[model samples]
Target: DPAAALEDHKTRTDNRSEPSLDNLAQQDVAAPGAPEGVSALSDAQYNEANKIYFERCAGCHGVLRKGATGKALTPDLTRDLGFDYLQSFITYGSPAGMPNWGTSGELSAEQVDLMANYLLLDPAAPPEFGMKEMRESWKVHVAPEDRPTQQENDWDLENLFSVTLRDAGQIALIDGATYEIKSVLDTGYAVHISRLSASGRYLFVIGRDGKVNMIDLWMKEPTTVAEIKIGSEARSIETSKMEGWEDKYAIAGAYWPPQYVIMDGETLEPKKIQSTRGMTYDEQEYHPEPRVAAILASHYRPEFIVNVKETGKILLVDYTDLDNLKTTEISAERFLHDGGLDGSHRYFITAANARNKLVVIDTKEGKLVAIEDTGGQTPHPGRGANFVHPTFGPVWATSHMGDDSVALIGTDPEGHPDNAWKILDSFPALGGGSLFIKTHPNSQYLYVDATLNPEAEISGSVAVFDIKAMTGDGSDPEFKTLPIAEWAGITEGQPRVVQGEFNKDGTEVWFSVWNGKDQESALVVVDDKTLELKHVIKDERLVTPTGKFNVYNTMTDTY
Candidate 1:
C-alpha cells in the first residue's frame, strides 16, 4: 500500500516531503494543468526519446512506465526525484542487474537528458487494439495450400536449432546432428524468441518489435512463409499443442499494445486481439499496459497459460473452441517474468522477480496452486531442473538474480507433504544473478549460466554440477566454474555465456557466447556425459548471437 500512500500524497493538504516513505515514494510534483517543471521537447525529439525508451528502458520499467522489476517511472515521481538522481541511476547502474548504459556506449548525454525529461510527462496508455485492428495488420505471404505438405528436403526438424542473431534481425537454423548452419533467415527485427509447433514442422518466431513470422521447416530453405504484425512490441508466442488440435491456432502476447493476437497456425492471419489492460487481480484498481511476460502451452489441457507481467494475472485461453473460445483467469503475484513447465508437465512455476518470490500454477486444474517463498532474490529458473533428489525425490531447481544461490524445492506437495512446494536445500552458485539452469532427463549433470553476475569473467562462465553426486551420498558435490573465454582459448576478450539448451537425448548442451556489442561470437557445445567442454562452433556469420532454441526443447516445452 506504499504506492497507494504515494498516490495519496499527490492530493494531500500539506505539501511537505517529511511524510514521504523511505527509499521509494517522494513529494508530489506539479498539480494537474500546472507547469511541469521542464519545458516540452520538439516533436522529433519526443519521437527519438520514445524510441530510445523503447529500446533501452521498456523491458524493466515497462512501456507505460508503471513498472514491475524496476520501479514505476510516473511523471511526479521522476519530476520530484530530480534529473540528477535519474541521470546517475541510468548512467551508472545500481547493485541490482540494471546495466550501465552510459559506459556501454548505448546512450549519449543529450539522449539521457531527453529520456529523463520524457519521464516527467503524464503516463500515456496504449490504443484500443481489437480484433478488427489485428485483422488489418495480417499478411499471409505464402498460402496454406502453397506450403509444403511433405518433407521437401531431408533435414532433421527434431534436431534443428533456431538461433537468434540479436540486433542483426535473423534466425539461423543450425543442424544439431552435424553442427552445421542450415539456413540463415531474415525474420522480424531483433527476434527475441523462437517457438515451435507441436508437430515440430512450423517455427513461430516473434521479435521484440512485435512482428510474428511463421517458418515452414519442411521447405528446402526453411524461411518465413507467412508473417503478421501483432503490435509495435512483443515477446511471448505459443502454438496449440493439445491432443485434438496440435496446430489448430497460434497466439502472441504484445508489450507495446498491451494485447494478445490469436491467428491461424498455417497462415499468420490474425483472428482476435484481446487487450489485457484492465483491473488489478485483487479487484482493486485499473492496471493498463499488462504485457504477457512468459507464455507456455499446457500438456494435459488445450490452453495457453498467459502470464501478464504488470498485472499479476495468469490467463488460461482455451483454444479448444476458438470460434467461441473460453478463457479462465486466476490471480497471482505481479511482475511475472521468465518461467517454464515442470518435468511431469503438471506444474508451472514462474518468478515474480520484482516480488522476489515464485508462484506455481497447476495447468491441469487451471488454478493458482502455491505461492512458495523461494527467499532467493529474483529467482529466475529457466524451465527449471527436474531431478530425483537423493533425499527429496522429484525436486525442481530455481536460480537467482539478486543472490548467489540456487534452491531445490520438492514439488509434489500431495505425495511429499513434508518438503513439497518448499525449499529442501539451496547451494551456492559461485556467483549472483544466474540466468538459466537446465538439465536433461538422460543427463546427470545440471548446467547453469551466471551471465547476470556483475563480474565480467564470472558473467562469462558456466557452472556444472554432478546432480547425482550433489544430491547423493548425503554430501555436497564440488561444483565446477568453467570459464568459457579462458577454456575456449579466447584471448583478451570476454565470453558472455547465454542459456544452456540440451540436444536430443541429452548428449550435448548447446550454449551461445552472447558477446554483446562485440563482432565475435560462437556457439559452445559442452559434453553432457563427461561434463567437459567438447566443442566450440565459431564463425564470422554469427554476429551478436544470444538465444539458441532446440526444436526438441521448444516443441516439447522443455524450457
Candidate 2:
C-alpha cells in the first residue's frame, strides 16, 4: 500500500496507449505470481481465490489459465487490463454462458476482486499438447476393419435413441421400441450431445470434459471403441452427414482452446487443428478467446458450418480438403449460439442472442444472408424446430430465453414468396424462458420446454401447439392462422422439463424430465397423433436425462 512497493523498472514498452500485454515487461509490480500493477494478495487470500476459481471458473477458463470456454488468463496477456477494470469484467459476466458471480450470490465483491487479480497473474506452464500429443492420442481400440460387417441386435437402428445422461457421465443406448436401456456406454464427463454416424452405425459422443467417444453401435452392446480429448470443454459435435462425406470424417467443436478438431470418421484420430480465435465481426478488434459455440454439417456442401460465439463469425470449413483447411468466413452478429437448419435443410440459422438477432447462414453460397432482428434476448433454439405454418407456408421456430413468445420466421426462401428471412408470426408461450422448441415433419403438434421461467412450476409444463387445427377454411387469401397453445405436464413435483425429440415415423414425441442430481430423471412420450401421454420411461439410474436424439431424425436432420 506504499509508493515504495508499486513502482517497477521497464524495458519492453509496447503499445503504451493500449492496455493488455502491451510490452508488459515493466509490470512486476506485485508479488512473484501476480501481475505488475495489481496489489499482491496474501497466502490466505490466494487460497480462497483458487478455491473459488476451481469451483466456478476452472471448467471454462481452465485450471492452467491457457483458456477454454473463457479466455486465456496467462498473467502477461492480461497485465495491462488494470485491476479495477478487470474486476468489473468478473463482476458482470458475459451472456455467453459466463455466470455473473458478483450477483450470483456465489461470490462477494471482495472475492471477485481478489480472483480477478489472481487471474491476471502469470500462470504456470501447462502440459503441452501439439501435433505430437494430438497424434499420439489417436487411439484405435477396435479398428474399422474389425468393427462390424452386419447388425447383431434386431432393434430398429433407425429408431434407436442416443440420450445424454448429463450428470451420470454415461450415454444410455435406449431401444426406442421397448424403451429399455440396452447398454450404458461410458464416455467423457457430462456428455453434452450424442451424434449418430451418417450410416447410423457409429455414435460420436462429446463431453464437457473435452473427450470424444466413437461408440460402435454395430456391436451387440454399444461400446466406445476409440476416444480422444479434443479440448477441455465442448458441446457441439456432428458427423459428415451430407451425401458423400457422411461417414468419411467428423468435427467436434471445442469451447476451450477455441478450436475445432477434425478427426477420421472410422478411428477417432485427429486430422487437423484449426483455432477459432480471431477478430470479432462487429468490433473488428482482436479477440483472444472466441469459443466455438456450435458445429453442424452443411446439407448443401462438403463443409461443417462452425459458429464462433464470441468472435461472431460463421465459418464454413471445407471438409473436402483437410490438409489445406480452407474456410469461408462470413461475419455476422456477435454471440452466435445453438441453431438449426430450415425446413428445406438449406439455410443454417443460429442465435446472436446478445445482439437480439437471429443469424441465417445460406450454405449454398456460404455467406451471411440475413441478420434478422429477433427482438428478443437469448433466443436459444438448439438445432431449431421447422414446420409448415398454415399462413407462412414453411417456417423455422426459435423460443426466447428472455421473452414470452416463440418467433416463427419463414425459412423457405423459394417457397415462401412473402416470408423469406422475415418473422412470419410470434406466438406467446405459457411464459417465456423457453429452451428447445420441437416438431416433427409429419406431426400436428409442436412441443416446447421452458427452462428459465421464474416460476419453476410453469417451467415444468411443455407448451404444445396444434398445427392442424390452426388450418382454417381460408381461400388462401386474406385469412390468418394461429396454433392453439396448450400446456402439458412432464413430471409431478414440477421437475425441469427439457429437450423434445420425435420418433422416426413422427408418431410419438419424447421429452426429458431433468430433476437434478439425486432425484431420478425420466422421459415422457406422447402420441403425436392423439396428443396423449403414452408412456413415462424412468428408472432409478435415470439421474439427469436432458437431451435425447433419435438415430433416424438426427441422421436425416429431421429437426
By lDDT, who's the top model here? Answer: 1
Please provide, for model 2 over 407-471, each residue's C-alpha lDDT reduced to its tens digit, 9 standing for 90 to 100.
Answer: 87888778766788887666677666678888888887777777556566666677777776655
- What TM-scores do the predictions have? 0.87, 0.83
Error of 2 at 6 (Å): 32
TM-score of 1: 0.87
lDDT of 2: 0.71
- Model 2 TM-score? 0.83
How many pairs collide in each candidate, listed in order? 0, 4
C-alpha lDDT of all candidate models, in order: 0.73, 0.71
Per-residue C-alpha lDDT of model 1 across residues 403-516, encoded as one tens digit per residue: 778888777877778877777787777587577888888888877787756578887788888777765343445788877755556543565677888887789898888765
Model 1 root mean square deviation, Cα atoms: 7.1
